[PDB]
Subunit: 237 residues, 3 copies
Amino acid sequence: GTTAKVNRIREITAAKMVEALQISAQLTHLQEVDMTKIAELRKESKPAFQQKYGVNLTYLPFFVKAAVEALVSHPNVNASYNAETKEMTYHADVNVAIAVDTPRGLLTPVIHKAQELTFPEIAQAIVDLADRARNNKLKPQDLMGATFTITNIGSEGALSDTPILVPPQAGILGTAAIQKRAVVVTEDGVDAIAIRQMCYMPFTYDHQVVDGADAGRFTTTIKDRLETANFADDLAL
Amino acid sequence: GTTAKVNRIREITAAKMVEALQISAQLTHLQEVDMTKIAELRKESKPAFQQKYGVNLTYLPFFVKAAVEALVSHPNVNASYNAETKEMTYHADVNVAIAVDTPRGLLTPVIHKAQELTFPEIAQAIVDLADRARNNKLKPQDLMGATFTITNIGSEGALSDTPILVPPQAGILGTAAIQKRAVVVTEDGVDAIAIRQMCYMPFTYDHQVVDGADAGRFTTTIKDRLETANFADDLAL
Amino acid sequence: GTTAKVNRIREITAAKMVEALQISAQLTHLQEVDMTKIAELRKESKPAFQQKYGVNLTYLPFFVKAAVEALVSHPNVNASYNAETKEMTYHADVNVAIAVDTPRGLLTPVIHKAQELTFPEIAQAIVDLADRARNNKLKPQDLMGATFTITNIGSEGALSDTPILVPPQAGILGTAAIQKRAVVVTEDGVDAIAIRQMCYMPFTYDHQVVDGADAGRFTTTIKDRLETANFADDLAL
Ligand SMILES: CC(C)(COP(=O)(O)OP(=O)(O)OC[C@H]1O[C@@H](n2cnc3c(N)ncnc32)[C@H](O)[C@@H]1OP(=O)(O)O)[C@@H](O)C(=O)NCCC(=O)NCCS
Ligand SMILES: CC(C)(COP(=O)(O)OP(=O)(O)OC[C@H]1O[C@@H](n2cnc3c(N)ncnc32)[C@H](O)[C@@H]1OP(=O)(O)O)[C@@H](O)C(=O)NCCC(=O)NCCS
Ligand SMILES: CC(C)(COP(=O)(O)OP(=O)(O)OC[C@H]1O[C@@H](n2cnc3c(N)ncnc32)[C@H](O)[C@@H]1OP(=O)(O)O)[C@@H](O)C(=O)NCCC(=O)NCCS
């Protein structure tokens, strides 16, 4: 067998995650989202979004925008717990970290003050932070101050996963692989089976900050936001 | 950002759960239950159950009754492990804690000697313990001695979750959101697709007390009990 | 209530698992596999496989063979992390432990150098190691040196589970209950709903060794291998 020392990114990520689990009470709430309406909006909007904003329109900014709005309407999730002083801090800014798969390991660059950004500014920030993280061109400020994380677990086809949150953060939302499924729809009391583009949306939360019912209300706001798919003015094409 | 000290319920719940994970070997077994027959029984029985027993008939007492019977036929699950003496204690009483979402945080009031109660007495005990927990009118004895916990994770629409068990308890059963799904049914070798009211029933267990095959046998007894839906004499209308 | 001391198998298994979670960063990636083609191959091959190799042909050796090939093409998964020296060791041999449910508790006997075995030799090794583990006739060498574990969580009907990996191992793959499901198939752009024999394939991995994208690539190789079901020359009937 052969041995090699890991780089500092993998060494620090591993140590931070081993420690994270020992100082928090993590659970993974499982929710699902019907992404069919967003998939149709995305298909027709991709050429116009590429021409006006210079980036490829993916599902991730839809999830990030819905999460940012939900972190503002559920400020109890955009919060941190201090086990020594037994105090909760509800953060004014929404600093969303984006998990980026890089050749050197996982990096989670932060979109600071994401509550002040438009949908296109979020899409451009994801592309910019990911390109710089993959080229290992991030400033130290780019990895500090996260209040929440969104991880694209579906990039390598995972149906779901149990993402690890890292205190002081209280939640991490996963955007699992969007797959066609046989699901029940109802219209005027008529239950029927449709083929819909669904994805699991696991949400790992720390019971020190968020209880199970709070996690449920939080993902219900995001689920309803994405399923309604009222993003035409957000796309601003 | 703003800071406030958490109440004693949230402070103690958080600390007990952080510690629980460090002194146990928790896994979450995933099972599903076809609740359609119970849903039909419940719909027709609700007016008569409200008139005779004074409570609204929900799915929770069906799960609690099936769990109590299964804790009596699987006494290895109604048990506790002592890591110092390397001893297992199989408890004579079935003291089922019910997770209640309250304005002050999660409370888990205990139905002591639940193996001695009728189905209506269990339904009335859930309503009574929940009302008192929400009004913070519980006696100290009401929160002690639990041998098992049942948590209604479906109250805020969760498909599933990974509930945290708290030693000395060895299992916690979740009753996730009952949703209409496209599922396969078989009759005389004819596989067909039906619309059924299904729910995931996650079961978190401590490998110190219950192994994976034991968890499977335990949830199979409960799954079969609920799917058969022979609760007419239990409803006693 | 009654108390009895647990045997050494259950005492050591429990302690090793409590410790395993505290010194690793475990996540459970969720994947699914369409086992219908393997189920059809297995049904027609069982009489000939029993006559030539002397064992009953089950799904488990298909999963083990696909996992062994994937541990050779993904050598980053057949690896161990040393948190003190911050070094990764990629193991030359694939020593697959098989979780066996025994009357005395869980035992995980190891198939050493599984990369050097034929599909029938793997099927015969599972039967041999399981029979000896159930009769508690294992040599000490039979439980040492595992680089990966495969656990048949579906034996007692579990839809899925979150198996606990034990360092220095970096992954544990679960073969959950194969159940008939309503799933979408596509042929020349025609989406349609079929009844397929599916199973969840949870994969618990240590973020100290394997990141989420690596876990996804690893299970995608296994998923594609089993779904293609090109096992005729492997069966060698
Ligand atoms: C930086 C990153 C998050 C950007 O994600 P993104 O905005 O979706 O962009 P990508 O360039 O990777 O997307 C590639 C394509 O796959 C699609 N896609 C990405 N994730 C998807 C998912 N979960 N389900 C379905 N389609 C998805 C995108 O819409 C895009 O489609 P298109 O080419 O048809 O327009 C991503 O590259 C990445 O690193 N993902 C891995 C995150 C990670 O490591 N998480 C840890 C757990 S795996
Ligand atoms: C105390 C408590 C458990 C009682 O549960 P209950 O017996 O189902 O009673 P509720 O009054 O809450 O039920 C409201 C209605 O929703 C239904 N319902 C409740 N849980 C359900 C579920 N999992 N799936 C579908 N329907 C459900 C009930 O049947 C009832 O329906 P009806 O009005 O048509 O008769 C509940 O109020 C509660 O606190 N739940 C949250 C538990 C918790 O915090 N768990 C932690 C993880 S979220
Ligand atoms: C040793 C062991 C792994 C062998 O598994 P195996 O090769 O599938 O063999 P078994 O004799 O147990 O299989 C019995 C039958 O069920 C089938 N079966 C087993 N697992 C199955 C699954 N996940 N889904 C569907 N069918 C399955 C087999 O194909 C066989 O079918 P057949 O009689 O029609 O030919 C198994 O006996 C065992 O101990 N399983 C439990 C493992 C465990 O404890 N894991 C911990 C988490 S539960």
